[PDB]
Structures are given as C-alpha cells and as structure tokens.
DNA sequence: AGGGACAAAGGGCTTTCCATTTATTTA
DNA sequence: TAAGCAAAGGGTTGACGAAAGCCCTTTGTCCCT
C-alpha cells in the first residue's frame, strides 16, 4: 500500500555557511583588510506610492543604514566559511522506513554534479546577490584543508565545465555520499570601482526608526548566513520550462517573483518522495532535486 | 437543570473542591472539603471523558453551577430538599495516592506523611482575577497537552489555560 | 550559643518550578525548611531555622509560557503506546544561584561542621536540582544584633525573602499591592484508610491543601532584621518567621 | 511466592547532570574566554509545508533565536558537572519486599560495563549531538576529585576499549557498586571554524514571538541538563536487532524517531522485573539494562 | 492423578468530548 | 530659530488522550474414574 512520512520528519542542515563579513581592500594588495561598516545616513526623498497621488509634493524622510567601500580602496572582500556536512540521509528527527526506504531508493543519485553546482555557485560568486553588478572583475578564492584556488570568470547562469571546480566537486561529492565534513573558507574580491557601494543583507525591523537596517556584527557590515546558504543551492534547472537556476525548495518557490516553479503540477519534492518510498522509479534529474532538498532541510510533516 | 443532573448521577457523578488531577492526569483522587467553601468560591466538575448534555445554547453544567453563587442557592437550601439531596448524593470522597507528590512535615516530636493536592477555587479565580484587573506578571499554562479535556470539565471549558505568578527576582548586575 | 553555616553561590539545576498549580518558580519555604530536617535526620545536626536569598534565578522557558520536558513512558499499561511521544502534564523547571543560612547548635570545633555539611551537599538534592558549584562553607558566630549585622554584610549581593502577610486573601492582594505569593503551610483534609500504598507504612497519611502567604524580596544590605528573614517550622503543619511579619 | 508488583514504584536518579554552559575561545589561548551570546535574528523563507501547495508562493518571516561564535574565535568551550550517587538499591516509593527480592537478585550483574559505557559516552562527545558534528578537532578535559584526564578522539557509535577511560570507569563503578558520591567537572573544546554556528538546547514552548528559541542563562548559550543526561543514559545496544545505542527507556522507545524496539516482545522492563522477582534466571545481556533504568530513575505504574 | 471447565485480571484497541479568552505586556 | 520622519509582501507546519467498553488469553480453584 503506502508508506507515509512520519508525522514528524525533520531534516537537518547539511550545509553550514557562516555569516559572511564585508571588508575593504585594494586590488593589487589584499592584506590590509579594513572593515566596511554599517553607517546610518538619512535620505530626504519623495512620497511616491502607486496609490495616494495627492501626497506627491510632501517629501518623506527616513534614516537608512548604508555601507560603502571607503574612498581609499576599490575592492570589496567577502569572507565566510561553509561547512558541507555528510550523513545526508539520516533523519534527524523522524527516521523510520521513510528515512531508510529513502536510503535504499536514493543511494544511486548523482552527487558529483550536485557538488559541482554547489561549488560552482561559490566559485562563480552568486553568493553576493547584488555586488556582482558594477564590478569589473571578480576573484573568488577558496581554501579547503590547506590548498587554495582562485577563480576569475565564470558565467553564472550556464554551469560551464572546467578543471579547478571539478576536484573540489569530487571532495564535496565524496563528503556528502559518506560521512564527515569539508570546510570551504572562501574570500570574494570585487573591484567595484573606487569607493563604490556594497550591499549587505538587510535585517527585518519590527516597527523601528530605521527603514533600512543592514546585518551587523560588531558595528561592521555583514551578510546573513542563510542568504549565503540560499545562494549555494540556486541549482534547480529541472522544472517546467527549465530556465534560470533558482534556489531549490520543495515547491520550487522564489518569493521575490511570488510564483512557485514546482508547485501544483505534480513536480514538488513532497510528491517526489511518496512514490519513491512506495517504490516507483525515480528519474535521473529529479532524485538529485530530492537529494538537494535533503541537503537543504525543512520539515516533512503529515 | 433536573434532566442533566439526572444525567450526571447516571454518569460518573463527581464534584470536588480539591483534587490532584492538575498535578497528573492519572490521579483519580477527589475530596469536597466543607468548611472552606465561601460565597464566591468556585468548584470544578468531572465525569468520564468529560461528557454532558447542553442546555440548548451550548451551555453545560459548569458555568451553570459556577455563575455567581448559583451553587450556593442550592447548597444553603432555599431551593428545596428535592434538588439539594440529589446534589448532596454526588459530592463523594474518592481516595488515590498514585503518581502524586508525597512529602513529610515535622509535627510535634515526629514526622507526618502528607500528599499535596490542588485547589479548585485558586485556578478559576486566577483565570478571572489576574486577567480582568490588569496584573501584568504571569505565566499562561495549558493542562494537559493536545487533548486537555481528559482531566476535568474545567479543563474542558477554557483552553487558554490557567495563570501562575512569576517567581523571578531581579538579579545582581 | 547559636551558630550559622552558609552555603554561597550554589548552582541548582533541574529544580522543578511547580511549587503549586498557582505558584510556579521558586519552591516554597516548606522545601528549604525541610532541608533542615533532611540534614537533621541524614546527618544529625539539629537545624532550628533557615533563611535564603537568590543570587540568580531563571525558570526554563519563554516570557509567558514556561513549560515541561517531553515525558518518558515509565508507566505500566502503555505497551503499544510507546512509539508516540508522551502524555505531557506541566512540570516547569528552573535553574538558580542561591545563598543559604542554617541555624545550628554544634558545641564542637568548626572544622567538622564544614565537612559535615559538605558531604551532605554532595548527596542531597535541592528540590530535584543538581548542585554544580558551591562555595566553601564557613561558620559565623553572632550573640547580638551588632554581630548579626556582620552576617548581614557578608551575603552581599543577594535578594533575601521576608514575610509580608495576607490582607484578606490571595489574588486580590496580588493585584492591588503587586506582591508575590508562595506556599507557607498545609491544611489536613482527609485520612487515607489504607497504608499499603505509602512510602513508610507506619505513619498515618492525610491529604493536604496549600495555604499561601505574601512575601517580599529585599536587598540583603537593606534589611533591618535577619530574624525577619529566617524561616522555621510552625503550627499546625505550617511555617513562620522568627521576626514575624515585616 | 506468587506475589504481585506494587502499583506504583519510585526510584531516585543516580546520574545527576548539570546544565551545559557555552563559551567562545581560540584554539591556542583558551584563557581569553567569552560567553556565546544568544541573539534573535529574523529569517525570511518559503512556506515549504507538507501539502498546502496553493499558498506555497508566499514568504514567512519569523524570529529565530540563533547562537554563533564571534568571528575573532574559532573554538566552542562547553562546561558542566556530573554527579554519581551510590546506594542505587533504595526504592523511594517501595520500601522493599518486591524491591528487596529484585535487589538481592541483581547483586551479580556487571556494574563495570555500565560505568565504562557512561564515561565513554560522555568522553566521546555524545552530550553535544550537533556541535560535535562539523568540528575540526574535538578534545575533552575531565577533572574528578583532584585528578585531570584529557581525551582527543573517540568513536561515539562504537564502544572501543582503551586504558585511559577504564580508570574513570572503575572509580565510578566503586561508587555505583556501594554507596557514596563522585563528581566530575567536564569541559569540551571544539575547533569549529571562524564564527561558526553552535546549537544549544531548544525550549519546549508555544512562544508567540520566537519560533525557535535557544536556551539561555541571562543571554548566554546553554544546554539542558537532562539533554546531557539523555546522552549519558544512551547505552542500550542489547535490544533485538541492535545497531545503534539508544536511551534507557523501559519500553526501549526513543520518541524522536517514533519507534519502539523493546516493547511488546517479552523484552521490555515490566516483564523482566516479573521474571527476576519470580525466580526466573535472566539473560546475561539483560541485567545491565535493568540496572540502567534504575540509575536513570523512574516511577513505574501498574 | 491431570486435563478441562469457571471465572477473575491484565491487556490491546477504540471513541470521546471538546469551544474559552486565542492575549495585550514588562519592571 | 523653522518647515517638512515612505509604501507593499508574507509571519509554518508535525508529534504530543485517561477512562469505559469489548474481546482474548491465562492461570487460581475444583472435579471425577
């Protein structure tokens, strides 16, 4: 008949990115790392809503948090650590016959191209979300277990094949397919131009004076760890009218566009599991989607 | 009132001003102490799996007996012996000590074993007095878990739970 | 000639906060006055009075809901009912850093009292709590109020507890004055006919109901009388204060 | 004989743990310590709920308590104490009789194996469950009755014999066999990475403001004491079809997984007490489990 | 002399009955 | 010292049930041929 997820089936994080930090460096010298800090400036713009055409002559004012490269340096440095953990399938919470029948039905996935797309997203620098634009050249350096690599140009929308991402893909694919962890200490260098604007992650502010407050650790501009871990997993290219590599979620849902790319057409992850536990043959490019959501996380309820 | 009181005695039929059901749902110990009952005091109510019949407005036996000393005008005895005797046939003593705290006290030259069981008035006057009159330091609890109607009918009626005071002193800087 | 022994900065962990169904947080004065009988029976040192402060205290949980661990399945009759989580009845716990003062008469050198309370701390539990770290006890001698003020100045910093008394009843007094109630005594209701389910099988057992009182949390550097802060056994099955009502 | 069990039975807990405390230190200079301050961040994600595919194109920003190491230190320090209390044969409720004919029927069991598994479970780092996962190098320091031992690497899943742990095993088995106390102060050190994420205990709460709340001591990250005592309790490899150690439960059910091993197959507790009381000779691999229940403590119904 | 009936005693599983405020709110 | 301090979009879901009733089985208690 049917096997169902346990009322409780929770899947812990198999990626642990640290919240990235934003530093200011020069281009020719990268050792004088000086914190880009969150400063609080004030804007005096316009009252311009789609509604309320009467209020179009009275200027609004709010205090926003801004972060720029200081006017002696022309490179933004983004420093983080990402821990790719193994023990992918073992259900943290939950875990009986919907964790083990998934193991006997999901041991033959493609971990290699999975790890290739994840290390490509770090290497092509899609982890910045706004600092790519207005940048002449990007240099992303990755250090794993006392070895260092440098990446100059990778067009991010099409996952090209090269030789300096592929061996890190072998390490990460070996560390998800078994036990353990692999630590990527990654530094992104962007020649944004002299004294340009950097874009940290905004925090939620619940009824505060600041209309725009950036993420802050010790007075200094920083980006959210879950924003980094969002941008590791923008690998999903197996949905209806496959196009952009969007972030992988059980409904294929980007909340900026307000449309879920895998929902309501029998393609979602949840659906793509009950057949797997029931024993149907999962194809080569959607069990990899299921495994990418295993290494994402989430709750798998009743 | 007569038909659902008759349903109550045909049911399990227990009323009580003191219980250990609030400490653990496996209690089944019930005593109606007599001398502590004053005009504004409140009483909870148990029958098996919290059953009952409404009074054609969704109104069960509890708020009936609880609403402003309704029970008093049958307990003092201005409503006749016909209702009062059938009311008195329900308040029985039921003893049980399992899964309850069992502590000691130093009496005169020796120790005494005694079981702490809870009070009926304190929970209901807590829900109706720390709430309505603006005391802004309390904890809100729900007993039991996802199915709270197993203990009593008081448990069954309000699902927001009772209120305790906070016992957190200010700390050294 | 009275003697004072002091347990300073004792880390209590796992202490269940449910003093009653209506007071939660600190355990009642019955707990800390029965600690004296616990060392009177287990060790043998006669304890006549007890006082307590709180260096730190926090009940485990959030701001309006403190709550309870997932229960075990430690009951017979739940053979197939073990795959599910638990039946969960509320039992909130706490953790705190406390100071304790015990009134003892020793008639012996003070180098034995410290070790004799030290080996009792390691085996007893503070209302289900676990002692993590505690300072070394020391013996204080006071014969008047002037030398009792030397006991007053050495508990700095702590927040001691003094009696305050009830005006008419509990929740009304908790509202208009904004004070704190806690259990100070127990009233006998009914005697259990059979003693085969007791833990002693000889002493008669009576059902009890908790009687409450109002208190006050006071800075230890600002209390006029320590005997206003000490607690002891009373009558009948109650506790009271040496110094009375503050 | 032919006597009935008590309808209620109470046992004191003879493994009394203290709650863990969390600090941030560097891997070389451990003196420069600071508490891991639990903060509250607010995360904007997708719905990702089982079923409910219609409202799967909407966000859900919720407040989550987080606890991260600061980005000047890369080491997580843990600190707690354990007490073992002798005279485990005294029933709280229960004067004896049934208790006494079980006590003298359980005098020839293996206290040393239970002691070694307890001190090996706390030595290997089972007390952590998420901070051990991903650490570059763990180490443990145990200070018991003015002697100090230090461990570097232990396999948590497999109980492997070594000479450094057997002395602690005997020194707590002496207290366990007779009467007394023994207290050990335990510290754990983990190289996690620069500004990594730690995992304190989460509270049981339906908090209206915080979704996932981490446990605090005036803001400092901390675990539950019974979370520690569950991992020291986790020894059971004597149930049928045993592969992993589970917690000592009278029905052999862990509730995170949602399954029950020892229940309902003439293996659980309340049959084995009736066997041992009525003169039946127990299996030589069952008697240390019965003992374990006792030391963990417990009431027992009828 | 021992299986078979007579019946108590545990034990698994099966409903069940709910409806108030959902708190606000921190020193 | 004086005049003016923005808008939408969402805010999770999963476990957390004692007692009466209904059958099923087992072993105290008693029986002759």
Short mmCIF file of N, CA and C in Angstrom, two decimals, chain C residues 11 13-15 42 56 58-63 65-80 82-86 88 93 95 118-119 121-125 128-134 197-199 201, chain D residues 6-8 12-14 16-19 81 83 85 92-95 97 179 181 183 203-207 213 215-218 224-226 249-251 253-256 258-260 263-264 270 296-302:
data_model
loop_
_atom_site.label_atom_id
_atom_site.label_comp_id
_atom_site.label_asym_id
_atom_site.label_seq_id
_atom_site.Cartn_x
_atom_site.Cartn_y
_atom_site.Cartn_z
N UNK C 11 24.83 26.32 42.62
CA UNK C 11 24.19 26.25 41.31
C UNK C 11 23.21 25.09 41.31
N UNK C 13 20.28 22.96 39.44
CA UNK C 13 19.94 22.67 38.05
C UNK C 13 19.04 21.45 37.98
N UNK C 14 17.91 21.59 37.30
CA UNK C 14 16.89 20.56 37.27
C UNK C 14 15.82 20.71 38.33
N UNK C 15 15.79 21.83 39.04
CA UNK C 15 14.85 22.07 40.12
C UNK C 15 13.48 22.39 39.51
N UNK C 42 19.44 12.82 58.15
CA UNK C 42 20.51 12.14 57.42
C UNK C 42 21.86 12.31 58.12
N UNK C 56 21.00 34.42 41.56
CA UNK C 56 20.34 34.44 40.26
C UNK C 56 19.22 33.42 40.26
N UNK C 58 16.25 31.72 37.18
CA UNK C 58 15.53 31.77 35.91
C UNK C 58 14.76 30.48 35.75
N UNK C 59 13.49 30.59 35.38
CA UNK C 59 12.66 29.42 35.12
C UNK C 59 12.78 29.07 33.63
N UNK C 60 12.88 27.78 33.33
CA UNK C 60 13.20 27.35 31.97
C UNK C 60 12.00 27.55 31.06
N UNK C 61 12.14 28.45 30.09
CA UNK C 61 11.07 28.75 29.16
C UNK C 61 11.05 30.22 28.77
N UNK C 62 10.06 30.54 27.94
CA UNK C 62 9.94 31.88 27.37
C UNK C 62 9.16 32.79 28.31
N UNK C 63 8.71 33.93 27.76
CA UNK C 63 8.34 35.08 28.58
C UNK C 63 6.96 34.89 29.23
N UNK C 65 5.14 31.68 28.47
CA UNK C 65 4.97 30.25 28.60
C UNK C 65 6.30 29.63 29.01
N UNK C 66 6.33 29.15 30.25
CA UNK C 66 7.38 28.24 30.68
C UNK C 66 6.77 26.85 30.66
N UNK C 67 7.57 25.85 30.30
CA UNK C 67 6.97 24.54 30.12
C UNK C 67 7.92 23.40 30.43
N UNK C 68 7.55 22.22 29.94
CA UNK C 68 7.93 20.95 30.54
C UNK C 68 8.55 20.05 29.48
N UNK C 69 9.52 19.23 29.90
CA UNK C 69 10.18 18.23 29.08
C UNK C 69 9.17 17.26 28.49
N UNK C 70 9.53 16.65 27.36
CA UNK C 70 8.80 15.50 26.84
C UNK C 70 8.89 14.37 27.85
N UNK C 71 7.74 13.88 28.31
CA UNK C 71 7.72 12.87 29.35
C UNK C 71 8.23 11.53 28.82
N UNK C 72 8.65 10.67 29.75
CA UNK C 72 9.05 9.32 29.38
C UNK C 72 7.82 8.43 29.27
N UNK C 73 8.03 7.14 29.10
CA UNK C 73 6.94 6.17 29.03
C UNK C 73 7.07 5.19 30.19
N UNK C 74 7.32 5.74 31.38
CA UNK C 74 7.66 4.97 32.57
C UNK C 74 6.40 4.56 33.35
N UNK C 75 5.43 4.04 32.61
CA UNK C 75 4.20 3.54 33.21
C UNK C 75 3.87 2.18 32.63
N UNK C 76 3.34 1.29 33.47
CA UNK C 76 2.81 0.02 33.00
C UNK C 76 1.39 0.21 32.46
N UNK C 77 1.09 -0.49 31.37
CA UNK C 77 -0.18 -0.35 30.70
C UNK C 77 -0.11 0.42 29.41
N UNK C 78 1.09 0.74 28.95
CA UNK C 78 1.31 1.51 27.72
C UNK C 78 2.25 0.74 26.80
N UNK C 79 1.96 -0.55 26.61
CA UNK C 79 2.78 -1.43 25.81
C UNK C 79 2.89 -1.06 24.34
N UNK C 80 1.76 -0.82 23.69
CA UNK C 80 1.78 -0.39 22.31
C UNK C 80 1.81 1.12 22.20
N UNK C 82 4.02 3.47 23.00
CA UNK C 82 5.38 3.89 23.31
C UNK C 82 6.02 4.56 22.10
N UNK C 83 5.49 4.28 20.91
CA UNK C 83 6.01 4.88 19.69
C UNK C 83 5.68 6.37 19.63
N UNK C 84 4.57 6.76 20.24
CA UNK C 84 4.19 8.16 20.33
C UNK C 84 5.09 8.84 21.37
N UNK C 85 5.05 10.18 21.38
CA UNK C 85 5.96 10.97 22.21
C UNK C 85 5.74 10.72 23.70
N UNK C 86 4.61 11.19 24.23
CA UNK C 86 4.36 11.19 25.67
C UNK C 86 2.94 11.64 26.00
N UNK C 88 1.85 14.46 28.30
CA UNK C 88 2.63 15.54 28.90
C UNK C 88 1.76 16.42 29.79
N UNK C 93 10.64 23.57 35.00
CA UNK C 93 11.85 23.53 35.80
C UNK C 93 12.56 24.87 35.75
N UNK C 95 16.54 27.06 37.07
CA UNK C 95 17.95 26.99 37.43
C UNK C 95 18.32 28.28 38.15
N UNK C 118 29.42 19.67 53.87
CA UNK C 118 29.94 19.49 52.52
C UNK C 118 29.59 18.11 51.97
N UNK C 119 29.76 17.06 52.77
CA UNK C 119 29.42 15.73 52.26
C UNK C 119 27.92 15.49 52.19
N UNK C 121 25.87 18.10 51.11
CA UNK C 121 25.53 18.82 49.88
C UNK C 121 25.69 17.91 48.66
N UNK C 122 26.77 17.11 48.64
CA UNK C 122 27.06 16.24 47.51
C UNK C 122 26.08 15.08 47.34
N UNK C 123 25.32 14.72 48.37
CA UNK C 123 24.36 13.63 48.26
C UNK C 123 22.91 14.07 48.24
N UNK C 124 22.59 15.25 48.77
CA UNK C 124 21.22 15.72 48.75
C UNK C 124 20.93 16.45 47.43
N UNK C 125 19.65 16.68 47.18
CA UNK C 125 19.21 17.43 46.01
C UNK C 125 18.32 18.58 46.46
N UNK C 128 14.83 18.56 43.72
CA UNK C 128 15.07 17.94 42.44
C UNK C 128 16.21 18.52 41.65
N UNK C 129 16.90 19.52 42.18
CA UNK C 129 18.00 20.14 41.47
C UNK C 129 19.30 19.39 41.66
N UNK C 130 20.28 19.75 40.83
CA UNK C 130 21.61 19.17 40.88
C UNK C 130 22.61 20.27 41.20
N UNK C 131 23.39 20.07 42.25
CA UNK C 131 24.40 21.04 42.67
C UNK C 131 25.58 20.94 41.71
N UNK C 132 25.90 22.05 41.05
CA UNK C 132 27.06 22.11 40.16
C UNK C 132 28.29 22.64 40.88
N UNK C 133 28.22 23.88 41.36
CA UNK C 133 29.33 24.52 42.05
C UNK C 133 28.79 25.24 43.26
N UNK C 134 29.52 25.15 44.37
CA UNK C 134 29.12 25.81 45.60
C UNK C 134 30.37 26.24 46.35
N UNK C 197 -0.12 1.60 50.20
CA UNK C 197 0.44 2.38 49.12
C UNK C 197 1.34 3.51 49.60
N UNK C 198 1.69 3.54 50.88
CA UNK C 198 2.53 4.59 51.41
C UNK C 198 3.99 4.28 51.15
N UNK C 199 4.85 5.26 51.40
CA UNK C 199 6.29 5.04 51.37
C UNK C 199 6.87 4.75 52.75
N UNK C 201 4.51 3.12 55.54
CA UNK C 201 3.63 2.05 56.01
C UNK C 201 3.33 2.10 57.51
N UNK D 6 4.08 -3.79 43.18
CA UNK D 6 3.43 -2.54 43.60
C UNK D 6 2.84 -1.80 42.42
N UNK D 7 1.70 -1.14 42.66
CA UNK D 7 1.01 -0.42 41.59
C UNK D 7 1.76 0.85 41.21
N UNK D 8 2.61 1.34 42.11
CA UNK D 8 3.47 2.50 41.87
C UNK D 8 4.83 2.17 42.47
N UNK D 12 15.08 6.93 42.76
CA UNK D 12 15.85 8.16 42.62
C UNK D 12 16.81 8.07 41.44
N UNK D 13 17.12 9.24 40.88
CA UNK D 13 18.06 9.34 39.78
C UNK D 13 19.47 9.41 40.35
N UNK D 14 20.33 8.50 39.91
CA UNK D 14 21.69 8.44 40.45
C UNK D 14 22.73 8.94 39.46
N UNK D 16 23.13 12.58 38.19
CA UNK D 16 22.62 13.94 38.27
C UNK D 16 23.53 14.85 37.46
N UNK D 17 23.13 15.29 36.28
CA UNK D 17 23.95 16.20 35.49
C UNK D 17 23.57 17.66 35.74
N UNK D 18 24.49 18.54 35.41
CA UNK D 18 24.25 19.97 35.45
C UNK D 18 24.16 20.47 34.02
N UNK D 19 23.50 21.62 33.85
CA UNK D 19 23.28 22.14 32.51
C UNK D 19 24.59 22.63 31.92
N UNK D 81 29.01 19.72 35.02
CA UNK D 81 29.44 18.76 36.04
C UNK D 81 28.49 17.57 36.04
N UNK D 83 27.32 14.25 38.69
CA UNK D 83 27.36 13.58 39.98
C UNK D 83 26.82 12.17 39.84
N UNK D 85 25.75 9.04 42.37
CA UNK D 85 25.39 8.84 43.77
C UNK D 85 25.21 7.34 44.01
N UNK D 92 12.45 4.70 46.59
CA UNK D 92 11.81 5.86 47.23
C UNK D 92 10.43 5.43 47.61
N UNK D 93 9.58 5.22 46.62
CA UNK D 93 8.28 4.65 46.94
C UNK D 93 8.68 3.24 46.81
N UNK D 94 8.15 2.37 47.65
CA UNK D 94 8.59 1.00 47.64
C UNK D 94 9.56 0.93 48.79
N UNK D 95 9.26 0.11 49.78
CA UNK D 95 10.10 0.08 50.94
C UNK D 95 11.08 -1.02 50.71
N UNK D 97 10.56 -5.39 50.05
CA UNK D 97 9.78 -6.56 49.60
C UNK D 97 10.04 -6.88 48.14
N UNK D 179 28.11 2.73 48.04
CA UNK D 179 27.47 3.96 48.48
C UNK D 179 28.49 5.08 48.45
N UNK D 181 29.46 9.24 46.66
CA UNK D 181 29.30 10.20 45.59
C UNK D 181 30.62 10.32 44.84
N UNK D 183 31.98 13.26 41.73
CA UNK D 183 31.63 14.41 40.90
C UNK D 183 32.78 14.73 39.95
N UNK D 203 13.91 25.21 23.68
CA UNK D 203 12.91 25.03 24.71
C UNK D 203 11.61 24.49 24.13
N UNK D 204 10.92 23.71 24.95
CA UNK D 204 9.52 23.36 24.73
C UNK D 204 8.67 24.58 25.10
N UNK D 205 8.16 25.25 24.07
CA UNK D 205 7.34 26.45 24.26
C UNK D 205 6.49 26.68 23.02
N UNK D 206 5.26 27.15 23.22
CA UNK D 206 4.48 27.79 22.16
C UNK D 206 4.59 29.31 22.28
N UNK D 207 5.81 29.81 22.09
CA UNK D 207 6.07 31.24 22.22
C UNK D 207 5.50 31.99 21.02
N UNK D 213 13.50 28.98 19.89
CA UNK D 213 14.19 29.69 20.95
C UNK D 213 15.26 28.79 21.55
N UNK D 215 18.15 28.01 24.53
CA UNK D 215 18.14 28.16 25.98
C UNK D 215 19.21 29.13 26.43
N UNK D 216 18.90 29.92 27.46
CA UNK D 216 19.77 30.99 27.90
C UNK D 216 19.98 31.01 29.41
N UNK D 217 21.17 31.46 29.80
CA UNK D 217 21.47 31.92 31.16
C UNK D 217 21.83 33.39 31.05
N UNK D 218 20.87 34.26 31.37
CA UNK D 218 20.90 35.73 31.18
C UNK D 218 21.41 36.15 29.79
N UNK D 224 20.29 21.91 28.07
CA UNK D 224 19.55 21.35 29.19
C UNK D 224 20.40 20.30 29.90
N UNK D 225 20.22 20.19 31.22
CA UNK D 225 20.95 19.18 31.98
C UNK D 225 20.46 17.78 31.63
N UNK D 226 19.17 17.63 31.39
CA UNK D 226 18.62 16.33 31.03
C UNK D 226 18.89 15.99 29.58
N UNK D 249 15.06 3.45 28.18
CA UNK D 249 13.64 3.66 28.34
C UNK D 249 13.03 2.31 28.67
N UNK D 250 12.08 2.24 29.61
CA UNK D 250 11.51 0.93 29.99
C UNK D 250 10.79 0.18 28.88
N UNK D 251 10.42 0.84 27.79
CA UNK D 251 9.87 0.14 26.64
C UNK D 251 10.81 0.14 25.44
N UNK D 253 11.90 2.66 23.56
CA UNK D 253 11.42 3.55 22.52
C UNK D 253 12.06 4.92 22.69
N UNK D 254 12.68 5.41 21.63
CA UNK D 254 13.07 6.81 21.54
C UNK D 254 11.98 7.52 20.74
N UNK D 255 11.67 8.75 21.14
CA UNK D 255 10.46 9.38 20.63
C UNK D 255 10.78 10.37 19.52
N UNK D 256 12.06 10.73 19.36
CA UNK D 256 12.46 11.49 18.18
C UNK D 256 12.26 10.67 16.92
N UNK D 258 10.34 7.89 16.81
CA UNK D 258 8.95 7.50 16.77
C UNK D 258 8.70 6.01 16.68
N UNK D 259 9.67 5.18 17.05
CA UNK D 259 9.53 3.73 17.02
C UNK D 259 9.80 3.16 18.40
N UNK D 260 9.46 1.89 18.57
CA UNK D 260 9.60 1.18 19.83
C UNK D 260 10.21 -0.19 19.56
N UNK D 263 9.46 -2.90 23.30
CA UNK D 263 8.09 -3.07 23.75
C UNK D 263 7.38 -4.19 23.00
N UNK D 264 6.62 -4.98 23.74
CA UNK D 264 5.68 -5.92 23.17
C UNK D 264 6.25 -7.21 22.61
N UNK D 270 8.76 -4.30 32.36
CA UNK D 270 7.78 -4.81 33.32
C UNK D 270 7.57 -6.32 33.21
N UNK D 296 18.90 5.74 36.01
CA UNK D 296 18.32 6.89 35.35
C UNK D 296 17.18 7.37 36.20
N UNK D 297 16.54 6.47 36.92
CA UNK D 297 15.48 6.86 37.82
C UNK D 297 14.16 6.47 37.25
N UNK D 298 13.10 6.73 37.99
CA UNK D 298 11.82 6.46 37.40
C UNK D 298 10.68 5.99 38.22
N UNK D 299 9.50 6.45 37.87
CA UNK D 299 8.36 5.92 38.53
C UNK D 299 7.92 4.78 37.65
N UNK D 300 7.10 3.87 38.16
CA UNK D 300 6.69 2.70 37.40
C UNK D 300 5.27 2.38 37.84
N UNK D 301 4.35 2.35 36.87
CA UNK D 301 2.96 2.12 37.17
C UNK D 301 2.61 0.65 37.29
N UNK D 302 1.31 0.39 37.38
CA UNK D 302 0.82 -0.97 37.47
C UNK D 302 -0.04 -1.36 36.27
#
